[PDB]
Amino acid sequence: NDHPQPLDAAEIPRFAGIPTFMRLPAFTDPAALQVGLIGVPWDGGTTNRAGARHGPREVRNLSSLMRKVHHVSRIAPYDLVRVGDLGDAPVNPIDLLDSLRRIEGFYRQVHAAGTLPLSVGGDHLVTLPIFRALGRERPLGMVHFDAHSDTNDRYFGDNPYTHGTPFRRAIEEGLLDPLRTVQIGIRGSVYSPDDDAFARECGIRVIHMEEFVELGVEATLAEARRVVGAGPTYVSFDVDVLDPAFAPGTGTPEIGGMTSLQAQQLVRGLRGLDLVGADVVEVSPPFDVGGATALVGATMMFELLCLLAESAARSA
Amino acid sequence: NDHPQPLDAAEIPRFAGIPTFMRLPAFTDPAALQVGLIGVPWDGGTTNRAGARHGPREVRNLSSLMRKVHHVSRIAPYDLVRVGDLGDAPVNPIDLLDSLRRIEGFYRQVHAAGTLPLSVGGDHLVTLPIFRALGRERPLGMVHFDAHSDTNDRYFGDNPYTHGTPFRRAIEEGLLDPLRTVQIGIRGSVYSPDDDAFARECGIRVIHMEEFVELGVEATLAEARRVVGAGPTYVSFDVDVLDPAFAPGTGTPEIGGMTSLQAQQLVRGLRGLDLVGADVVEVSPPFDVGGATALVGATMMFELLCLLAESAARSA
Amino acid sequence: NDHPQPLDAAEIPRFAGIPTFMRLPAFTDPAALQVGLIGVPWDGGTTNRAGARHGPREVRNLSSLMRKVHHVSRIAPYDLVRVGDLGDAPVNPIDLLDSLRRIEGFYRQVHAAGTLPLSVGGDHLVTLPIFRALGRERPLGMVHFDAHSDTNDRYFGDNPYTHGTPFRRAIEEGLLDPLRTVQIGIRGSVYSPDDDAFARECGIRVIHMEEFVELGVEATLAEARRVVGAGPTYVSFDVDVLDPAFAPGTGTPEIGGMTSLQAQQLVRGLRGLDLVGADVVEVSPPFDVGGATALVGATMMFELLCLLAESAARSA
Amino acid sequence: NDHPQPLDAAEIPRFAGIPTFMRLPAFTDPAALQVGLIGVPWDGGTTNRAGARHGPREVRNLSSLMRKVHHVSRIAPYDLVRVGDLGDAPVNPIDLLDSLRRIEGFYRQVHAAGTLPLSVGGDHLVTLPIFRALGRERPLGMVHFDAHSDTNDRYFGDNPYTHGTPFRRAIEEGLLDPLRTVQIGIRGSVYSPDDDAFARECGIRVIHMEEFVELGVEATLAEARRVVGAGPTYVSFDVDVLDPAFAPGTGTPEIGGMTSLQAQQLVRGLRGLDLVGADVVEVSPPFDVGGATALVGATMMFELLCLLAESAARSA
Amino acid sequence: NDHPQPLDAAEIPRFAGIPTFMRLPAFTDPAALQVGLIGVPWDGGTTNRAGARHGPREVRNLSSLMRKVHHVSRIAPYDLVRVGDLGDAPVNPIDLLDSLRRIEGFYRQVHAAGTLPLSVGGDHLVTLPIFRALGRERPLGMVHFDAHSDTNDRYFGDNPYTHGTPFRRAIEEGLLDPLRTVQIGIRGSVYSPDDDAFARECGIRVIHMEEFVELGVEATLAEARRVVGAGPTYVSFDVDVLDPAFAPGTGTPEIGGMTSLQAQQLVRGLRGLDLVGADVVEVSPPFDVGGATALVGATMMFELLCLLAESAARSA
Amino acid sequence: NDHPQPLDAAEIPRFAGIPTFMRLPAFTDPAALQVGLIGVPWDGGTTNRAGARHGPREVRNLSSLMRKVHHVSRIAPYDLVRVGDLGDAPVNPIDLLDSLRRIEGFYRQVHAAGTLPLSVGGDHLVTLPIFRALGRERPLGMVHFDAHSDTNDRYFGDNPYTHGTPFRRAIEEGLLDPLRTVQIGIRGSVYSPDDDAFARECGIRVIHMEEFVELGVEATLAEARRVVGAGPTYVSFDVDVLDPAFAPGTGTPEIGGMTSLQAQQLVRGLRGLDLVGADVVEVSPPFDVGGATALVGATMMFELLCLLAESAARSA
Ligand SMILES: NCCCCCCN
Ligand SMILES: NCCCCCCN
Ligand SMILES: NCCCCCCN
Ligand SMILES: NCCCCCCN
Ligand SMILES: NCCCCCCN
C-alpha cells in the first residue's frame, strides 16, 4: 500500500508497543500526512473540574483497542489516505494566552500543508485556536455534539477565553458561520431565563436533548445535514453530550444524555459531508473510571477518522 | 429581589465555599423558608449493604454543579419562593426508635412553619418519620419511583422498621392513602411467589418495570396522574429505580432499570400537581463511583425543587 | 419439596454465609442435581486483556443478591428442580491443551448424569470444551449474545484455540449446527472488509448491533426463535454484548452495546425452548467497577436458570 | 494425617474453588474441629463509618492467597490440628440485643465442644459476645492490638454497647481480667481530656503508639508477655492498629500507625502462650482498596492460626 | 467554653451536619477568632498533575474524624483559644494575578485582626499571597516540610509564579528570611546538575530525605529549632513530603518519603516556638484514594492547630 | 552533548508528548545506544493474578515524572552515555515457548551490539530469556529483590516455565552463578516444609525479610556486595519485594515488606559494581492504584539506569 499502517495485530499484541493514536507511526512533518491525529493537552479554559489536559495521553492508550476497518461503512481509512500521529500541539499550562498563540501557530502549519486535523482535547477552548487557523479564508459550518452551547461571553469579571466561550469568539471573529452551525444534546440547568439568546440572534440551530428525543436519530440527522448543507464543515464532539454512564470522565457532566450507540449512529450519518476537521474534547482522566471515557474518545475518534479519510481523498 | 440565592458563580467558583445544597445559605429556622432542603443521614433500617447515612453529605457536594434556572420549564426556583439548606435532621445511629422520634420532631417544626420539605436520605426508612410529620391531617397521595415496593411487614422476625417497611407502616398509621399511591419501576427477583400480596389487597397501583416499558413514558405519566388526582401528593424518588449504570451507589440494585433521562422526563411530567413534599433516597457513597449517584441525587433534587417551588408559589 | 434451597434470607442476611452460587449447597456429584451451577475459571484463550479467570468467584459473591422467585414468570427454580453449586471445572492456568482436555472430561461426567449445565466463565473459549461434551451425539443449536462472532480461524501463527475461535472449532467438529445458530449484538471495528465470510458461507444468522436496533427486541426475538426452532439449544451469553456502561468488567469492550434491560427481555423471551444448557462468560473482575459486571453476570445467570429449570422439569 | 486440608494448590489454582477460609472444607459441627475459623459479620456497634459486616466475606476471598506452612516458625497448622471453616455466627442486622444473644449462643456451642475460635469481624463489639461464651470459668487475659482502647461507657445517651465499649463491658461482667490485659498501639485525638481514666483505675496496661515507638518490638513483646503471664489468653487484633497505608479498609483510621511488618513480628512473639481464642476485627470492605485490608486480615488470621494450632496440640 | 466548639459528637454523629473544619461553626469576621481555619482552593500554579483546588473541601469532609484533645500534649485548642472556620479565600481560576491579589487581600484582613491563620491549599503557590500579607513588617522564619524546595525561578519562559517558585518569590520580596528557613524531606531527580544553587547561595538550611534519615527525628528537630530560633516562624506542610503510601493524593509525588508517624513527631516537636501561621498544602482529591490524603491533611491540620493555639494563648 | 535527551520539560510539559521511557526518543537499532530501555510485556508465566503484560505501558506513562539528574549521586545518565527506548521485545500471548525464543532473539541482538539492557516486565519469567542471551560466555552474578526466591521446579504437572521458576532454570542452564547470587526480602507462607531445598543446596545467599530487619540496610548492603564481588552482576528488582502499601499493583503480594525508601537506599549502594543489566518486574496495572506501582517501577528504573550508565561509561 505504502501508507502509514497501524502495528499489525496478527503479530504485535495490542498491549505492546509505544502508545500512539491507532498504533500508527509518529510524524513531525504535517505534509507527510493527509489526516493528522493531534493531541491538544490543554485545560487552561476550565473553571471548575479540570483534568482534560490528560485526555490525549489516555485516548492514545485506549486507541490500542481500535481495528483497521469500520464494520458498517467498510471504510479502511489507512488504505484510503495517509494517516499518522502528529504528536501534541504546544501547550503552556501556566499561560493561557501563550497556549492560544502557540496552538494557533501549530494549526496553521497543519492547515498550510493541507492536512485535515483530527484533534483530541483538552477542554472545549482548544477548538478556538483550531478555528482561528482553519477558518481564515472561508467561515466553517459545524455539527457540534455537546451538553452546552459554549457560546457564553465572560467569566469571573471579563475573561473572554474559557471552555464555555469558544464558539462565541469563533463567530465574532468570523471563523464560524452561525447559519451553518447545529448543536445537538444541550441540557442541564442554566444561568438565565432565556439562555439561547445569543444562539437565536445569530441563528444557530440548537437541538436540545429534549428535541433530540422528540425527533429521534433520523430526523435529527436530516436536520443537521440540512443546516450544514454542501459547505466546509467541522465536527466537534464533546464527550459530555453522552450520559455520565457512558462518559463519566468529564469535567461538566449533565445527566440524562446521549448513549454511545446514539452518538455512533449520528456520526456515521454524516457520511458524504465535506468534513474539514474534527475533534473529541473534554475527556478528563482524573474523573474517569477504568479508562471508560478514554475508550469512548478513541472510538469516536475512529468513527470521525473514517469520514475524514473520505473527505481527504475527495479533496485531493 | 430578596430571596436566598446560591453563591454567585461569576464570583465564587463551584469548587469553593462550604458546601450546602445548591450553594444556598444555611438556615436553622424553617419559618424563614417556603421550601426547605433537608438531609436525613440515616440507614439504621438497611438489612444488607448500608452507607446511605453518607448520602446527604455527597449530594450537597455534588449539588455544586446545579445552576439557577431549569432549561425546559424556565422555573427559577430561588426567585419564585424562598429556599434554603436546613442542615440535617438529628439522627441516632445506635437507636432506631430514638431516630424515628427525633427525625419526626424536626419535620414537625418544618410542617408547623408551613415549609414544604425536600429531603435527601438515608435509606428508604427515612420517609416514614417524614410522613408521620406530614400526613396526620389528611392522608397523602404518592408518586413513588423504586425497584422495591417497600411495603413489607416484619424482619428477623418481629422488627417493624426497615427500609423495606416504611409504606406499610405509613398505610397502617393512616398517613399514606394507598388508593392514591402509584409505584413505578418495581423489578427484581422476589422472596416468595406472591410479592404483591399487601400491595394488591389495599389497592396500590404497581407499575412494574415491565409494564413501564410496555406503556412508555407518556402513558405511565398519565396513569400516575390519574391515581394521585388533584389531591395533596408526596414524591419519593429512590435512586435504585435507575439502572446501576446511572446509579451504582445504592444498597439494593436490580439490573435493567430506568435511565436518568427517563426519570427526568417522568418527574417533569408531575408539573402542576399539589406537591406537599418529596425526597431522594438510597444514595450510598461507599458503593458510589466518582460521585455518579450523588450527582444523580443532586439533579433529581433540583428537578423536584422546581415543582415544589411552583406549589409553594400557588399557596402564597 | 426436599430440593436443595438457598440460605433462608429471612433468617440469615445476604452478606453472611459462604459464597456459593445463589447461596445454595455445594455438591461434588452431578447426579444429585438436575441443573448444575459450574464455574470455569479459565482465560488462557485471551490475547489482550485477561482476568476472566476470576469471573466465577466474583459472580459467586454477587449472586448473594439474587432471590428465589422470578418476578415476571413466577418460576421458583429450586422448587421446580434440583439445583446446586457444582464447584469449578478443573483448570490449568499454564497449559491450554491440558485445560481443554480436563474441562471436557468434567463436562462429560455432568452430561452422563443427565445434569443440565449452567456455566460461568472464564473467557469465551470455555464454551468449546463444554460443547465437545454436550454435542457428541447430536449437534446443538445456539442463541449467542456477543459483541464478537468468535468464529475466527488462527491467531499469532497457527494457534487454533483462543476466545475468538470456539464456534468456528465447534462447527468444524460437528458439535454446533450453524443453520441453527443465531448471533445477536455483533459490533465494533474489524480486521477485514469481509468479516462475516465464514458465517455467511456456513449459514449462521448474524444480527449485528445495527440490525438489532432496526429490528427491535420483539422482532429480534421472533427471528432468534425462528432460527433455533424446536431442536436442542444452548444459550451462550457474553457480557461484552452489553454496553460497557452496564458491563465494564470485560476484556474486549465495544461501545454502543445492549442494555441490561434488553438482555433480560431477550433472554426471558426464550421461554419454552428445549434448552440443554447455558453459560455466562467474559466477566473480568480486574476491570470491573464495584462488582457491577459480576452482578450483571449473577442476574443473567438467574434468568437462564429459570428457563433451564423449566426444561429439566419437562423431561420427567 | 487424616486432618482437613486446603485444596491442593499444585493441582487447583488459587483463583479457583468455593471461597472458604484458607480454602478449607466447610463444617457445621464444632466438635469436628480443634480450631474453628468463624465469621462474625456484624457492625451494629458502629457509630460512624460502617461496612465491617462484609469483612468475613472479603477475608474468606483473599485468604485464597495463604499457603500451608509458616516460613519462620515452620508451623504447619493443618498438620498439627484439625482446622475448618465453621461458617458465620448468626447475626441480626436490625436488632443489636438479639445479635448479642445469638452470637453468644453460637459461641457457647463452640466452647462446649473444646473448639478454639479464630474469628473475623465484624466491628469490635463482636468480641464481647465471644468473651461472654469463653470467659465463664476463669476471666481471660488479652493481648489487644488497636488504635483505640474500646473501654468507653455510654454513647448517644445511655447505650452501653458499641464497638468502643466491648472491653469495659467484659471487665464489668468479670469475663476479662484487667490485670492481665495489655493494649498496644493506642493513638489519635480524644474527646475526654482524661480518656484513659477507666484503664488506669482497674490497671489495664496501655502501651500507646508513642510508647511502642520508644520501646521497640522486642521490649514491647517482653512487656506484653509479662502482663498476660502463663494464664489463658485471647488475642484481639484490630486492623486499625495498622497505619492506614497498610489498612485503609477500616471504619475509624488514625494515622501514624503500626506497619504490617511490626504486627507480624508482635504476633509471632506470642508463641508459647496459652491462647484460647483470637480474632481479627474491623476489616471494612466498603472503604478498602483492592482488598488490601482483607489480605492483611487473612494474613494476620494465618499468623494467629499457627499459634492457636500449637496451643490446641499442647492440650491434646 | 464560650469559645466556639466542635459539634458535640455525644449528640450529633460525625457523618452529619454541613461539614466545616473540625466541625466548628462558620465565621465571616476574623476579629471573632484567635486562630482562623482557612481554605485556599487554588491550583493555577500547577504545571502538571492538578486538582488541589478541591483540597479544602475534602479536608473539611475528613476533619469530621478529629476529636477535641490532643492525646499526647493534652492541648485542647478550643478551650485554650477561639477557633473557627473562616471559609475559603476568594479565588479566580482563570486569572492567576487576580487570585494572588484577592487571596492576599483576604489574609490582610486576617492579619490586621491579630488572627493566626491555619490554611489548607491548594498547591504550594498559595503560601505566597499568605507570606505577602504576614511578612511585610518583619520577614518570617520557616519550618518547611516538602519533597521540593519550591525555590525555582521561572517556568515555560518567564512565568514567575508556580507551585515550585513561591519561596523564591518570598525571599526576593523580603517576606522570608532565608537564614531562618529550614527545609525537610527534599528528594527526587532534579532538572539540573546543581540544584540547591539558590538555596545554598542565600543560606537556607536544606535537610534532604537522606540527611533526615541519617540524623533521625530528634536531631533533625534540634537542627530545625536552631535555624528558626526564638523569632516568628511559619510552618508550611506539603503532604508530598510523605511517601505516596501515606499520601497518594498529591500532584508531584516522589517515592521513598517520610511516614505519617514521623511527620506527627516532627510537628509535635515544634511545641513552644513562636508560630504565627501554618498551612497544609498539595492535597489533590482527583488523585486521592478513599480520602486518605484528605485525612492526613486534616490530622496534620489538627497537629498544627494545637501549637498555634498555645502561641495565640501566650500572646493574649 | 550529542546524546539522546528526554523531551525538554522547560518547553514541553510532562503530560504531553508520546509516552516513551523517560520521554526519550524511540530507537529500533540497539547499536545506537549504550543503555537500552526495553519493555517485555509478558505474563504467560503467571499462575494466579495476571496483568503484568500491561506493566511496560504504564511504567512508560509514569516515567514522565522522572527528571534528568540524580539528586544524591549527581549522575546525569543521558549526558554520560547514549540511552533510549528500544520498544517492546516481541511476545506471543498464546505461545509460551515462542515468546521464550523470540524474546531471547531480541536480547541476543541487544547483547551483540554491546548494549546494556534495562528492562520492564512482564512477570518474573521475563528474566530467563534475558539471561539466556546475556549469560552464555560466563555466568552472571545477581542482586535480586523479591518476596519469592523464584527457584521452584515444575507447576501443574511438569511445566518448567512460570514466574516462580526462572532462576532454577537459569542456574540449571549455567547462566546464573548461584554462589554469586544474593536474594533480599523473601517472605510469606510456603506450600510445603521444603520448598527452600534447592536454594540452600546450591548456596544462593537468601536474606529473608526477617534477616534483612535484623541486619539493617547497611549490613544487608555489605553482605550483598560481598556475595557478588567484582564479577559481572545483574540486578533483578521485583516490585513485590516492597510492602503492598508501596506496591499494590502486583500479582503475588506478601504483607510485611520493604519500603520504597529502603529499596532506594539498597539500589543506590550498588554503585561501582560491574552491572551488565537490570530489570524491574511484576508491575501489574489491573491491580495498581492510581498508578502507584507504575511510578515505583519508573523510579526504580531511573535508580538502576544511573548505575548502568556508569558501567557503560567505564567500559567505553
Ligand atoms: N462507556 C464505555 C467506555 C468503555 C469502558 C470499558 C472499560 N472496561
Ligand atoms: N450518572 C450520574 C452522574 C455521574 C457523572 C460523574 C462524573 N464525575
Ligand atoms: N496492606 C496491603 C495488603 C495487600 C494489597 C495488595 C493488592 N490486593
Ligand atoms: N530520594 C527519593 C527520591 C524519590 C524520587 C521520585 C520518585 N517518584
Ligand atoms: N493515610 C491516611 C488515610 C486513611 C484512609 C482510611 C479510609 N479513608
Short mmCIF file of C-alpha atoms in Angstrom, two decimals, chain D residues 106-237:
data_model
loop_
_atom_site.label_atom_id
_atom_site.label_comp_id
_atom_site.label_asym_id
_atom_site.label_seq_id
_atom_site.Cartn_x
_atom_site.Cartn_y
_atom_site.Cartn_z
CA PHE D 106 -23.26 -19.85 68.78
CA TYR D 107 -20.04 -19.36 70.74
CA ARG D 108 -21.07 -21.37 73.80
CA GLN D 109 -21.80 -24.27 71.45
CA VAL D 110 -18.30 -23.77 70.04
CA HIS D 111 -16.83 -23.58 73.57
CA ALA D 112 -18.78 -26.63 74.87
CA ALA D 113 -17.04 -28.68 72.15
CA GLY D 114 -13.48 -27.72 73.22
CA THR D 115 -13.01 -25.86 69.92
CA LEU D 116 -10.69 -22.83 69.89
CA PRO D 117 -12.29 -20.00 67.90
CA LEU D 118 -10.40 -17.87 65.37
CA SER D 119 -12.78 -15.11 64.41
CA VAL D 120 -13.06 -12.50 61.69
CA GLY D 121 -15.28 -9.48 62.44
CA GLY D 122 -17.33 -7.50 62.17
CA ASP D 123 -16.62 -4.43 64.25
CA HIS D 124 -15.00 -4.66 67.69
CA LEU D 125 -18.30 -5.13 69.58
CA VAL D 126 -18.18 -8.65 68.18
CA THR D 127 -15.60 -9.68 70.79
CA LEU D 128 -17.97 -9.12 73.72
CA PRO D 129 -20.40 -12.00 72.97
CA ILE D 130 -17.33 -14.17 72.31
CA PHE D 131 -15.93 -13.32 75.78
CA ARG D 132 -19.38 -13.97 77.22
CA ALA D 133 -19.02 -17.54 75.93
CA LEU D 134 -15.30 -18.04 76.61
CA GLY D 135 -14.86 -16.16 79.89
CA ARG D 136 -17.25 -18.07 82.17
CA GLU D 137 -14.90 -20.29 84.17
CA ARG D 138 -11.77 -18.13 84.60
CA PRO D 139 -11.63 -14.47 83.43
CA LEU D 140 -9.39 -14.11 80.35
CA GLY D 141 -6.11 -12.32 79.78
CA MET D 142 -5.71 -10.45 76.47
CA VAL D 143 -3.15 -9.02 74.10
CA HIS D 144 -5.16 -6.43 72.23
CA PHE D 145 -3.88 -4.54 69.17
CA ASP D 146 -5.90 -1.42 68.47
CA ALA D 147 -5.74 2.31 67.86
CA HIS D 148 -8.48 2.71 70.49
CA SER D 149 -8.91 1.37 73.99
CA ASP D 150 -12.54 0.33 73.37
CA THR D 151 -13.25 0.80 77.09
CA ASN D 152 -15.80 3.62 76.92
CA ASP D 153 -19.07 3.63 78.82
CA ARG D 154 -22.08 5.14 77.02
CA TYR D 155 -22.83 6.54 73.54
CA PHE D 156 -25.65 8.82 72.30
CA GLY D 157 -27.47 8.74 75.65
CA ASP D 158 -27.44 5.52 77.64
CA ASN D 159 -26.33 2.98 75.03
CA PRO D 160 -23.91 0.53 76.66
CA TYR D 161 -22.96 -1.46 73.53
CA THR D 162 -20.85 -0.11 70.64
CA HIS D 163 -17.53 -1.04 69.01
CA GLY D 164 -16.00 1.28 71.62
CA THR D 165 -17.36 -0.42 74.75
CA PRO D 166 -16.78 -4.17 74.48
CA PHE D 167 -13.84 -4.33 76.86
CA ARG D 168 -15.35 -2.18 79.56
CA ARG D 169 -18.44 -4.41 79.45
CA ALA D 170 -16.30 -7.55 79.53
CA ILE D 171 -14.42 -6.26 82.62
CA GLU D 172 -17.63 -5.25 84.47
CA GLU D 173 -19.07 -8.74 83.67
CA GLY D 174 -15.96 -10.42 85.12
CA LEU D 175 -15.10 -12.07 81.82
CA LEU D 176 -11.90 -10.10 81.16
CA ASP D 177 -9.20 -9.68 83.78
CA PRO D 178 -7.96 -6.08 83.63
CA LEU D 179 -4.72 -7.01 85.44
CA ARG D 180 -3.92 -9.33 82.58
CA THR D 181 -4.91 -7.03 79.73
CA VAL D 182 -2.32 -5.34 77.54
CA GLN D 183 -3.34 -2.83 74.85
CA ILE D 184 -0.87 -1.85 72.15
CA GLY D 185 -0.89 0.99 69.60
CA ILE D 186 -3.35 3.48 71.12
CA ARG D 187 -3.19 6.88 69.39
CA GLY D 188 -5.28 9.70 67.91
CA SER D 189 -7.09 12.75 69.25
CA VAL D 190 -9.56 12.09 72.08
CA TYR D 191 -12.85 13.55 73.31
CA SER D 192 -12.14 13.27 77.04
CA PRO D 193 -9.20 15.33 78.39
CA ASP D 194 -8.58 12.29 80.63
CA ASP D 195 -9.50 9.39 78.31
CA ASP D 196 -7.52 6.60 80.00
CA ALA D 197 -9.34 7.04 83.37
CA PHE D 198 -11.02 3.62 83.39
CA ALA D 199 -7.92 1.79 82.19
CA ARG D 200 -5.84 3.36 84.95
CA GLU D 201 -8.37 2.69 87.79
CA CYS D 202 -8.54 -1.08 87.06
CA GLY D 203 -4.86 -1.50 85.97
CA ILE D 204 -5.05 -2.23 82.23
CA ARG D 205 -1.61 -1.91 80.67
CA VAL D 206 -1.89 0.61 77.87
CA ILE D 207 1.10 0.82 75.55
CA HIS D 208 0.20 3.89 73.44
CA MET D 209 1.68 4.26 69.93
CA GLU D 210 4.27 6.73 71.30
CA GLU D 211 5.49 4.21 73.92
CA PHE D 212 5.61 1.35 71.41
CA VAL D 213 7.89 3.52 69.25
CA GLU D 214 10.20 4.23 72.23
CA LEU D 215 10.15 0.59 73.42
CA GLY D 216 10.59 -1.09 70.05
CA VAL D 217 9.19 -4.52 69.14
CA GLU D 218 11.34 -6.82 71.33
CA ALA D 219 10.72 -4.82 74.53
CA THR D 220 7.01 -4.23 73.80
CA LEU D 221 6.69 -8.01 73.49
CA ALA D 222 8.54 -8.70 76.74
CA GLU D 223 6.07 -6.35 78.41
CA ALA D 224 3.04 -7.91 76.73
CA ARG D 225 4.14 -11.40 77.79
CA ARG D 226 4.81 -10.26 81.37
CA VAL D 227 1.26 -8.83 81.67
CA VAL D 228 -0.56 -11.94 80.36
CA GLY D 229 1.78 -14.48 82.02
CA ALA D 230 1.03 -18.22 81.84
CA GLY D 231 -2.77 -17.91 82.13
CA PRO D 232 -5.47 -18.32 79.43
CA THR D 233 -5.14 -15.54 76.87
CA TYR D 234 -7.22 -14.22 73.94
CA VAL D 235 -5.70 -12.19 71.12
CA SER D 236 -7.81 -9.46 69.59
CA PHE D 237 -6.24 -7.83 66.57
#
